Symmetry: D2
Subunit: 189 residues, 4 copies
């Protein structure tokens, strides 16, 4: 099974989460895992001065999403929604929608926020788009307990962005990757 | 694989849909399908006076949900949420939650509305509860072609006179067949 | 302006919050505040055996909601939704809906959770129902500084032992005072 | 009271809706009404070939949103969310968020979809962002009935985009503008 971890990060928190997700998915016999980012939409000059952490992963094209059996989407919270960059990317998936290209594929979502507020809404409002594509949606449930959510792995970046993901947050992200990849093998070999 | 179509219905619209869902699921080789309803919470007297439709389906218990590989949940829209009867019932599943009893099982949702507005919120706000249980959620996507990609729906009309259409029931059957197919793929 | 704090609580966490909300609203010159609870739906015997907290607040009726200029609704999180007791109660407001009885009135929501997850969905899925009634919805935004901009919340802890904190109750009082201020501005 | 109708349109459906909203808000004694769009993010070449209807309204800056007492947001549905263009714009409102610049201002939302699916989610997922800004959220309720929603005015563009808004849809949009502007005067004079 092919698993895409597809993400947007501006300050590295989601990027770090993506790595943990991918490590988890890689644990699964039969799963092949790829990590990619959506294009930055900000001019580099502004991205630079805003203190952005330059992202170096291969940039995905909307078309290649059809190639995977499972897609795990990572986005930071922007006032309770996915980021503009992820929204702009997913708005380029009309071709795939028309052809049913993602229909029945596994989808799952992870996020990051400054202080907690909006993490749940970011994940569930992302599930909406995945459901229009006919994707099968995988939440994590009470995994953690067996300041997060049953909807997907999250991390807190802190008010000033200086917090880094904890071992426990990375563990939950890794679990999410492992579990989705396991589902993807059970369904697609 | 074992599939439960669990529904609430007060005027029979969700009941008609539930039957169609159960049929679609039945078409799948390897799938065993049961239809149950959640308990009415209205006193029988007021249900009657409200013009509520009486129903033959057996009443489910909260604890038996753990028996099934896939649960397809049917609720009418009540201002953009599931019904209080469905809500009350699911609030009784804390035991299953604690033991991880529904974790990883498939869930899917269908609904009915008077005039349309709220059918999407009903379905997605029911997904929320399914996700707390760690259920895998199955929307229907563009099979929905106003229906919804989130699951099958029917329009009851403002006075409730309208009955599920051929096309609406056909989408409902699609949904059962789709979820049942996934259940057999995952569980045999 | 008249403000109703309408709440459901099984272990007293939302009850404590409701009191604080009612106080904040009371601080507003021109605001008159009433606290009521929605009916328990559990039989008294099982409520008791469940370790439920008994409550002094008068029980509201669905129809009296139309009396108020602002309603602040308190519910614990039940897998990311309002409680079945709150859901059942609001399902009884079809009469108010038909007559436009709550249209334009202010609504605001607060909640309680065991461990946090679901508090945001509880609040926004309650807003849905308020919007069907045409109520104007008041979130609290960055006064929330894990709380939520959607309305005041408290963490009950996994075993329910934790009680609302000084800070959490202070946000709850802010919310009542804010909504009551808006009610007086709109209605005098 | 100053009322901003702030919108994104790619094929004109939301644009037509915006005009109706603005007409409604203008009916109100004491309300002054302005219509603006968010920047197109698409290169014009692509916008051209996709058959976009060039938008000609003044382009809003994130900063000027602080100047209004009420903002009515219009966006088409993109798989159950606001469009990338509106998301990208609202992601530039961090300055306003930090200063509480939109706190307590009135907000309301209208939408458009191809075939209905996702209109409710687009509106409520937009309310999320408005709530982070502390905005007071105004749905329309059962206005229509006294294929739409109580959350805000909507229009159906049809599967091929050829449908135009009906008189009844425009009437509901106008009502939304009138009602929000009326609220804005009652609160701010
Ligand atoms: C425009 C904008 C909106 C934001 N909204 C929220 C919010 O609603 N809640 C929150 O906790 N943090 C919010 N933040 C903080 C971001 O979520 C945080 O920077 C992000 O999680 C970091 O992830 P990254 O390092 O991968 O970019 C916001 C930040 C920006 C720039
Ligand atoms: C309390 C209550 C709230 C309702 N809210 C809505 C609504 O928000 N939108 C709508 O289109 N219909 C609404 N209706 C109509 C129901 O959705 C409709 O009667 C139901 O779908 C019929 O299904 P059933 O026959 O299976 O009970 C409501 C009905 C009641 C009794
Ligand atoms: C059926 C049920 C479901 C619950 N679901 C959640 C949940 O999803 N997330 C959470 O953090 N707590 C959950 N809890 C804990 C409640 O939110 C907690 O007991 C409540 O907030 C206490 O408020 P009260 O004392 O006012 O009743 C649940 C409790 C019950 C009984
Ligand atoms: C990327 C993309 C995603 C879309 N998703 C949906 C959808 O989920 N539901 C729907 O009915 N229409 C969908 N459509 C149709 C648009 O909503 C429609 O073009 C829009 O409402 C027209 O408004 P405008 O003329 O102002 O651009 C989508 C269109 C595009 C280009």
């Amino acid at each position: 099974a092919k698993v895409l971890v597809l993400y947007y990060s501006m300050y590295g928190h989601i990027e770090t989460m993506a790595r943990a997700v991918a490590e988890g998915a890689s644990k699964v016999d039969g799963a092949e895992v790829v990590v990619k980012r959506v294009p930055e939409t900000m001019p580099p000059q502004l991205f630079e001065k805003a203190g952005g952490k330059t992202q170096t992963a291969p940039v995905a094209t909307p078309q290649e999403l059809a190639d995977y059996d499972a897609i795990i989407f990572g986005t930071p919270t922007r006032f309770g929604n996915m980021s503009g960059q992820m929204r702009t990317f997913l708005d380029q998936t009309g071709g795939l929608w028309a052809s049913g290209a993602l229909y029945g594929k596994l989808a799952s979502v992870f996020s990051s926020t400054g202080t907690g507020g909006g993490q749940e809404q970011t994940i569930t409002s992302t599930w909406t788009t995945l459901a229009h594509h006919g994707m099968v949606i995988v939440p994590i449930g009470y995994a953690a307990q067996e300041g997060g959510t049953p909807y997907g792995a999250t991390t807190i970046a802190g008010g000033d962005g200086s917090r880094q993901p904890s071992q426990e947050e990375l563990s939950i992200a890794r679990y999410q990757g492992e579990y989705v990849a396991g589902l993807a093998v059970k369904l697609n070999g």
